[PDB]
Structures are given as C-alpha cells and as structure tokens.
Design a binder for this molecule. Structure first.
Ligand SMILES: O=S(=O)(O)c1cc2c(O)c(c1)Cc1cc(S(=O)(=O)O)cc(c1O)Cc1cc(S(=O)(=O)O)cc(c1O)Cc1cc(S(=O)(=O)O)cc(c1O)C2
Ligand code: HEM
Length: 108
C-alpha cells in the first residue's frame, strides 16, 4: 500500500463509527476489547502495556507505519492471520488515508 496524507477530520469520524467500539487513542486511555493505540506508530505490534494479545499479533512483530497500517486495515486477518480483531476492513483507499491521517495525530 501507498499511504497519502488525507483528512484527519474525516478520519476522526471514521474512527468514531468504525474503531471506537474497541479502541481508545489518548495517552493512558483504557484498553477495551482491543488495546489502547497511543504510540502505535513507530512501535512494534503486540506491545501496548497491559493488554493481552494473540500470539499472531505479537509474533507478526511489525514496526507499524502508514503503509503497513493501510494494508492491515484493508483486511486485518489477511495481514495478520489468527488475529482476534473482528473488523472486516476499510475497502476504500480514501477512507484508509483519512483514518490513518487521523490516527497519526490522535495517537501521538
Ligand atoms: O475534505 S477532504 O480533504 O477529505 C477531500 C479530499 C478530496 C476530495 O475529492 C474531497 C474531499 C471530496 C470528496 C469527499 C469524500 S468524503 O470523505 O466521503 O467526504 C468522498 C469523495 C470526495 O470526492 C469521493 C471519493 C471517494 C474515494 S474512495 O473512498 O477511495 O472510493 C476516492 C476519491 C474520492 O474523491 C478520490 C480522492 C482521494 C483522495 S486521497 O486522500 O489521496 O485518498 C483525496 C481526494 C480524492 O478526491 C481529494
Ligand atoms: C478501523 C478501525 C480500527 C482501527 C484503526 C484498529 C486498529 C488496530 C491496530 C493498529 C491494532 C494492532 C495493535 C498493536 O499491534 O498493538 C489492532 C488490534 C486489535 N483490534 Fe483493532 N482497529 C479497528 C477496529 C477494531 C474493532 C471494531 C475491534 C473490535 C470489534 C477491534 C479489536 C481489536 C483487537 C481485539 C486487537 C488485538 C488483536 C489481536 O491480539 O490479535 N479493532 N487494532
């Protein structure tokens, strides 16, 4: 995938409707079904303090960046088979760019 900076404003709404059910973004925010995502970019997968991940998410050991995040969010279980993230994917490229643009800001 080839991430292109988009609209964090539209990304924020996508996060609310598609991700917030299972994730927080703020520093020190609580885990839910999924891990809090603060600091995700530039850290390896499966490392949020205090959260119990699948073996798949840990052993994937990917250094998250905007491009591999775009691939992941297209189809999570294809990128990380054995994941327990029950999310089908954002099939639209502009949605992925906008969501990732938001996520970069929100998880800083
Ligand atoms: O306000 S924005 O900065 O987000 C904006 C950027 C672009 C835009 O063309 C528009 C808004 C108008 C517009 C908005 C939306 S919305 O996010 O749903 O509100 C959707 C579209 C649109 O033209 C339609 C559209 C959809 C898709 S798809 O989801 O991938 O199928 C792609 C595009 C669309 O125009 C092409 C496109 C991509 C991108 S990208 O950020 O490079 O992916 C920016 C802009 C684009 O027109 C350039
Ligand atoms: C597009 C919206 C979403 C985004 C941006 C997102 C983002 C992420 C990211 C980046 C990871 C990897 C975290 C890491 O490696 O530390 C992850 C894992 C996870 N997510 Fe999501 N997610 C979304 C939707 C969801 C939804 C809707 C759910 C719940 C139904 C969910 C539940 C989980 C779970 C359980 C994990 C850990 C998976 C595992 O251990 O295998 N996510 N998510």
């Amino acid at each position: 995938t080839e991430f292109k900076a988009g609209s964090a404003k539209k990304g924020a709404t996508l996060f609310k409707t598609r991700c917030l059910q299972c994730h927080t973004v703020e520093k020190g925010g609580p885990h839910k079904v999924g891990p809090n995502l603060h600091g995700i970019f530039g850290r390896h997968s499966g490392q949020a303090e205090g959260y119990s991940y699948t073996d798949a998410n840990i052993k994937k050991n990917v250094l998250w960046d905007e491009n591999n995040m775009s691939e992941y969010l297209t189809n999570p279980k294809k990128y990380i088979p054995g994941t327990k993230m029950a999310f089908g994917g954002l099939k639209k490229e502009k949605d992925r760019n906008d969501l990732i643009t938001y996520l970069k800001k929100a998880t800083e």
